[PDB]
Nucleic acid binder design. Structure first.
Ligand SMILES: [Mg+2]
Ligand SMILES: [Mg+2]
Length: 98
RNA sequence: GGGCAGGGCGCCCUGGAAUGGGUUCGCCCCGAGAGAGGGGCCCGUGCCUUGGAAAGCGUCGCGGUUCCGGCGGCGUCCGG
């Protein structure tokens, strides 16, 4: 599933609710509003491990995106770069099924 | 020494930004958190004050007929 994840991301971007960035992703997972977290592969190792531990506490799925932050950003369609991304809800998608 | 200007910060908190925005003479900065608020720190050789007017200086006048840090009056102001 190379382009399937990208297509799902592009669909949830316009359909559901998302959170770009790290601090307000941490707020969402702490408040339990996050259903899925996506991490770029070049994010700092300590930050990555902290995110996984937080998600293990919150019983939430974490997916390691194949690309780095720049490609994650352009997959999300934003013109900046993002390391950590959160799905509040897909709305109309099957991303959280996988 | 004390206080306050005034400079700098790759320091923090709230919040999350595309219709992209902030900004320099140039640059440069931002979901690894911009703008917008509120704070914190450092240097403060500048200003005020303690020192400090008592001293210094500029003038006018008396002295020791001299050997005198001699004695007196006034001023040492406001701005760009
Ligand atoms: Mg700012
Ligand atoms: Mg005098």
């Amino acid at each position: 599933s190379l382009e399937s994840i990208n297509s799902r991301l592009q669909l949830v971007m316009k359909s559901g609710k998302y959170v770009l960035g790290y601090k307000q992703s941490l707020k969402m997972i702490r408040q339990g509003k996050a259903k899925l977290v996506i991490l770029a592969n070049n994010c700092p190792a300590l930050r990555k491990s902290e995110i996984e531990y937080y998600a293990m506490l919150a019983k939430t799925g974490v997916h390691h995106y194949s690309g780095n932050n720049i490609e994650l950003g352009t997959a999300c369609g934003k013109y900046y770069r993002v390391c950590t991304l959160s799905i509040i809800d897909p709305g109309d998608s099957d991303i959280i099924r996988s």
